[model samples]
Target chain A: PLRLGGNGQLQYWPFSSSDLYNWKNNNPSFSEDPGKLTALIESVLTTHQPTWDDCQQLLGTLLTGEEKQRVLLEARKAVRGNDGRPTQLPNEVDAAFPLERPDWDYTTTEGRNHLVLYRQLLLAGLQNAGR
Target chain B: PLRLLQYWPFSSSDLYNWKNNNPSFSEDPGKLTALIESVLTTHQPTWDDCQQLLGTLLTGEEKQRVLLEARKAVRGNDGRPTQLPNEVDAAFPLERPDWDYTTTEGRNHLVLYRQLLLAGLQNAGR
Candidate 1:
């Protein structure tokens, strides 16, 4: 939704409802208020980051049952080594799953690959929203 | 070459067991191949057939090592990582790492997967 400004100008959401103006909200797969997306947006606005739970919440909303499972399964692949022993069990991991932007400095291709691939997977999940 | 197969630790004597022992795995080679494909990522290459698969080629210790590394790589999933602006979905995205493979654990796990991947590639007759 939009409104017209005083001098015959087109103004988008002058009333400050990001829900209407934000791409995230307008997305076909976008969800209701106070959902994972809400929490995700809240976290993003601030300097603080969201958790894997955040990804699970928001991304799951846009995905279909199968797509959701596939994408999640793929994401979990990063955890398991080649043998596919245990991706999330009986492990002593001291680190977090999410990555910070600053952490992806122009260093190794490995870092860049994660950044690119994660985003791709999220979007790929979205593409299957209505399917 | 079959030379590599000759050196496979589990080739003949002790490769007779698996958790399920459901003859289906041996009879249905495609099943195992698909499982391998499903677990593999874009970063890794795979073989079309499991006839020359490495599952029976490696020692139990190697399989455990690979599984352990893979699990370690994912240990962080139970926790949160550094956040980014829309790191996940575009709408209510969460944070994910740009990821650092430099950590001792991360490096080791990653290397393990690569070894597993390469091993599969070779065993599959790629």
Candidate 2:
């Protein structure tokens, strides 16, 4: 089975047919963010050069609540804006999946994750209000 | 008048308006290629990565003649693939402007430029 490890890295562990017990681990595929927004920000900031901050601001303004959450979830996967750091796993395992180890620390993951979720929820609330 | 010097960089010179004769030289802006391609190629090849050949080949093939020329013209300014050094200026000065000096001693411009010119010529020729 292709199991995503707690580290957010993908690992394909193959089960042996004879025993259906032994599993061999495969190589890991490194994730890369294509857009380089974070890198650009780093460069601009490091160079002390001015950059257009409106794009990031607009994204926050446009998305809220569930939609915001979904975007944040996706954005976390994005390699940019993270200062080239990988997405950290939560410290506590998810209650829903107790058997699974924590992929990142709870505070870090939830801080980012909930911010997205709240954004999504807020947007949904707004949409419902319009109705 | 803002006279463009032989080198591509912008130059601001002045002449006395009273006599419309007395002229003085001004500073020129230097030309720089923002995109660094030649360096990428040099590094990639020297490093022994084979995948880059595919990208280069695809670029050459997909951009037949005109599209090729346009991309080449645009690519010339790109800082990738040429080989470590900066974009070279052409040897012979373009006849269109006789007074201009050659900015770059390297024909890297026209070698790449002619390829683009040829591609354009071919498309226009077509």
Candidate 3:
């Protein structure tokens, strides 16, 4: 699964647990258990797109809603922030990397799934959470 | 260029005193990070002082934009739980004022800027 990052250029990111990994790196609280955060990261990475319920299902209310969002956002932050990527960047990665080569645009069905998930999560905060 | 700020209760004066404080409060980098750290050490400031600063500095719409961007810059408020203080603080730089400290609004923006910086930075720890 992929999602948006703080930087719009890198926004169309993969829906991989790698994003969760980055989240912990960027925001430490979620990583505190050490064992648990990594464990949860693994769980989400495998899915195409994770739901808020999925986060709650695995991690439970142990994390606040805002905590959850930080984790989710940071997960996507990894690919770009780490910036050590594919000799073959995902089609999405490739389009962005050269800065403006305009090589190609790609997204998997999983990409759509991740996009939907991202939208739902962001909207959820904006509408109800007043974010 | 705009300097970094930790909270909204500050202005060029704080920036100045920080730079020249007796021996001086030299910063790590002159970037936003330095600016932020400089103001965090201030005696706590309130919105009353800030709005006074705000009202004196701005007339109408610019003040309005500053307020809007300040809100936009914060992570959680209204009903949202403050999740990302660092992330929220990051927004202060993200919105309207790249807000060059070189100008007056830069000074005035500090009113809400410090409030939210204080607001956000205080919130996101755990």
- How much lDDT does each candidate structure score? 0.34, 0.27, 0.38
The all-Cα superposition gives candidate 2 an RMSD in Å to the true structure of: 23.2
Give the per-residue lDDT digits (tens) of candidate 1, residues B1-126.
011112111223212322232134335444444334322321122121122234563345544443333333332234553234332122111122232243566444444444444444334422
Q: Which parts of model 1 have CA positions greater than 4 angstroms off?
A: A1-20, A31-74, A77-80, A84-86, A89-102, A121-131, B1-126
**Per-prediction DockQ scores?**
0.01, 0.01, 0.01
Which digits, one per residue and each the tens of the lDDT, describe model 1 over residues A1-131? 12234775422211111222242434443323324443343334232222232333334233434655664454444454446454554231112134222343213465446444544444433333312
Candidate 3 ranges beyond 4 A from true positions? A1-89, A95-131, B1-98, B115-126
How much is A4 displaced in model 3, in angstroms? 28
- How good is the docking of model 2, as DockQ? 0.01
- Tell me the docking grade of candidate 3: incorrect
Q: In model 1, what is the error at residue B3, expressed in angstroms?
A: 56
Fnat per predicted structure, each in turn = 0.00, 0.00, 0.00
Q: Give the C-alpha interface root-mean-square deviation per candidate.
A: 24.3, 27.7, 17.8
Model 2 C-alpha lDDT per residue in residues A67-107, reported as the tens digit of each score: 43444444333322235454334422122112222343323
